[PDB]
Amino acid sequence: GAMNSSNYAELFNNDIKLFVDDTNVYRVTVHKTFEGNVATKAINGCIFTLNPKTGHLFLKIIHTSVWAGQKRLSQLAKWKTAEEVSALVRSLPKEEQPKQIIVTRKAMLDPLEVHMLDFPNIAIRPTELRLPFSAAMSIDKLSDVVMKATEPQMVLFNIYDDWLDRISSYTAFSRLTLLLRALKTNEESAKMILLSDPTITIKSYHLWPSFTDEQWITIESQMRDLILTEYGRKYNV
Amino acid sequence: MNTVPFTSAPIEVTIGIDQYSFNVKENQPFHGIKDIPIGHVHVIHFQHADNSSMRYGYWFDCRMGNFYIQYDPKDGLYKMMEERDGAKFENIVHNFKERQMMVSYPKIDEDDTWYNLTEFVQMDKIRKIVRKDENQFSYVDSSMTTVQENELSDPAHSLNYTVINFKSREAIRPGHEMEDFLDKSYYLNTVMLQGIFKNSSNYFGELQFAFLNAMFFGNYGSSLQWHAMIELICSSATVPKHMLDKLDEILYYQIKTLPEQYSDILLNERVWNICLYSSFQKNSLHNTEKIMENKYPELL
Ligand SMILES: CC(=O)Nc1cc(Cl)ccc1N
Numbered sequence: 001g002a003m004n005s006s007n008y009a010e011l012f013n014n015d016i017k018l019f020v021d022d023t024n025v026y027r028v029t030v031h032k033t034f035e036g037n038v039a040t041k042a043i044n045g046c047i048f049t050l051n052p053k054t055g056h057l058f059l060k061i062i063h064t065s066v067w068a069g070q071k072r073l074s075q076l077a078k079w080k081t082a083e084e085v086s087a088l089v090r091s092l093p094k095e096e097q098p099k100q101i102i103v104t105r106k107a108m109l110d111p112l113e114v115h116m117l118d119f120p121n122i123a124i125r126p127t128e129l130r131l132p133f134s135a136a137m138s139i140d141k142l143s144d145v146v147m148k149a150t151e152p153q154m155v156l157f158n159i160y161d162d163w164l165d166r167i168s169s170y171t172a173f174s175r176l177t178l179l180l181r182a183l184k185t186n187e188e189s190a191k192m193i194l195l196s197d198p199t200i201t202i203k204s205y206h207l208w209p210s211f212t213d214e215q216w217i218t219i220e221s222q223m224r225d226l227i228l229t230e231y232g233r234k235y236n237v
Numbered sequence: 238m239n240t241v242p243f244t245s246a247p248i249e250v251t252i253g254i255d256q257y258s259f260n261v262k263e264n265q266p267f268h269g270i271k272d273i274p275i276g277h278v279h280v281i282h283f284q285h286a287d288n289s290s291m292r293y294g295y296w297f298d299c300r301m302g303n304f305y306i307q308y309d310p311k312d313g314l315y316k317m318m319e320e321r322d323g324a325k326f327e328n329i330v331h332n333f334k335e336r337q338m339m340v341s342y343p344k345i346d347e348d349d350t351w352y353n354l355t356e357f358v359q360m361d362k363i364r365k366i367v368r369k370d371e372n373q374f375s376y377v378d379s380s381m382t383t384v385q386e387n388e389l390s391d392p393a394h395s396l397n398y399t400v401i402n403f404k405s406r407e408a409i410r411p412g413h414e415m416e417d418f419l420d421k422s423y424y425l426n427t428v429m430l431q432g433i434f435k436n437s438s439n440y441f442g443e444l445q446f447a448f449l450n451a452m453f454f455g456n457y458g459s460s461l462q463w464h465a466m467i468e469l470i471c472s473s474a475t476v477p478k479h480m481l482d483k484l485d486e487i488l489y490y491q492i493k494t495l496p497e498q499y500s501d502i503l504l505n506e507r508v509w510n511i512c513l514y515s516s517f518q519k520n521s522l523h524n525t526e527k528i529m530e531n532k533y534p535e536l537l
């Protein structure tokens with residue numbers, strides 16, 4: 001069934017599962033033509049495929065060449081996503097393949113189901129959660145590898161850095177979703193919060209700064225302020 | 238002109254034969270239906286006065302034998318049987334006809350109402366969907382489930398319609414996932430028409446039989462099958478032109494015959510709106526779209 005606040009700890013049990021977000025697969029800039037018409041120009045995109053228990057992120061970079069000569073690109077993008085997720089699963093050893101794939105947008109259900117017909121025992125699920133994975137391209141190192149790619153490429157990351165050495169995967173996911181929600185709400189402020197203090201460094205092999213436990217509580221508090229303050233003004237709440 | 242005689246009518250019942258329906262009172266002197274047109278399959282159906290639950294009936298073709306109906310008080314229903322003694326059946330029937338104890342299948346001057354609903358329906362194909370090989374006629378009722386319903390529980394009493402499943406390996410060629418799912422022509426023309434049904438007449442026959450079972454008996458799985466067979470065609474970009482033209486005629490007469498008060502449940506909003514307004518064949522079913530918009534504009 002559908003994933004929501006009521007079955008939220010299921011994400012951190014010992015059944016392998018992946019979130020798939022397709023919101024950054026097909027990306028365009030809209031611009032004027034010399035004749036005063038409007039056109040789009042595609043830019044590189046990515047599939048965000050995330051194990052929420054381990055932090056393992058399978059970032060499939062979608063190079064603009066995949067759109068050349070194709071029609072109905074927003075529809076094609078969903079099928080391309082499902083094709084690449086199916087290929088990822090097939091590439092994994094049986095004992096690493098997921099038991100469930102949770103898609104962040106319901107329009108991914110039929111494309112993924114059809115591409116996974118060979119795997120009848122992998123459940124394809126939607127979610128009622130409004131997860132902020134679209135903001136993944138606000139993470140500087142992920143944006144950089146996507147925009148620099150000159151061909152199709154898969155890049156592997158741990159989106160939790162080393163956090164699991166000190167916190168549980170429930171806490172890590174909660175921190176990730178808070179950071180991403182903040183970046184989605186007000187990217188400039190969120191990024192100021194994260195990278196205003198120069199003594200705190202992002203290790204070469206990490207995505208986020210090397211905050212002490214105490215600094216993470218301050219940071220997390222600051223992100224909440226940004227987000228409910230901005231929920232704050234969106235509504236007159 | 239052939240005859241389906243009755244041994245008697247011990248319980249009050251609404252009998253129907255094709256589109257006709259009539260009431261027989263308990264122990265009324267009723268001994269059958271004569272003047273049944275030769276050349277068509279027919280269905281003789283029953284709904285008891287006491288228990289409107291379970292419409293039941295029999296598909297038959299009088300060219301295949303001499304069939305009569307007798308009430309079984311143990312099993313509580315009117316049963317079709319075959320009398321092989323032709324001389325005896327003739328005598329029994331002549332007896333009833335002389336005493337004017339039979340109703341008359343009417344012959345209407347400009348009438349193709351039944352032909353147009355059963356054009357492609359053949360007894361031999363009915364008997365493969367409804368498996369009961371010792372009888373030349375086929376029993377159907379409101380409750381019988383289909384083979385595909387049972388995959389999601391008594392096999393002998395099932396409707397063995399051809400299974401259609403749009404998210405199945407049979408429907409989707411490896412490597413053509415998006416292509417085959419959004420344009421089902423492969424599945425229609427190669428898997429189903431060339432492979433399973435062999436020709437469009439057999440496809441249309443099963444489609445027409447499913448509709449009639451859904452309409453006369455409220456067989457939910459028959460309704461599912463009818464709509465699935467419509468949707469497979471409408472969702473195919475590449476359909477022979479003769480098939481589209483005939484489908485339009487088939488559906489027109491089905492929609493024309495449908496009781497107005499049963500459309501609410503007998504028509505699936507999603508399939509019809511998709512078929513008439515979104516599908517590849519949205520502009521290929523003129524007669525059907527016109528009668529649907531004038532008879533059931535609410536569904537749309
Ligand atoms: C009276 C009975 O038992 N049999 C019979 C009756 C009719 Cl209507 C027709 C054929 C037969 N065998």
Ligand SMILES: CC(=O)Nc1cc(Cl)ccc1N
Binds near residue numbers: 258342343
């Ligand atoms: C109009 C008409 O004759 N209806 C009808 C048909 C059969 Cl077969 C038997 C009884 C009736 N009333």
Ligand SMILES: CC(=O)Nc1cc(Cl)ccc1N
Binds near residue numbers: 456457460
């Ligand atoms: C319970 C019931 O009426 N089911 C049903 C039967 C047919 Cl034939 C068509 C649609 C429905 N819902």
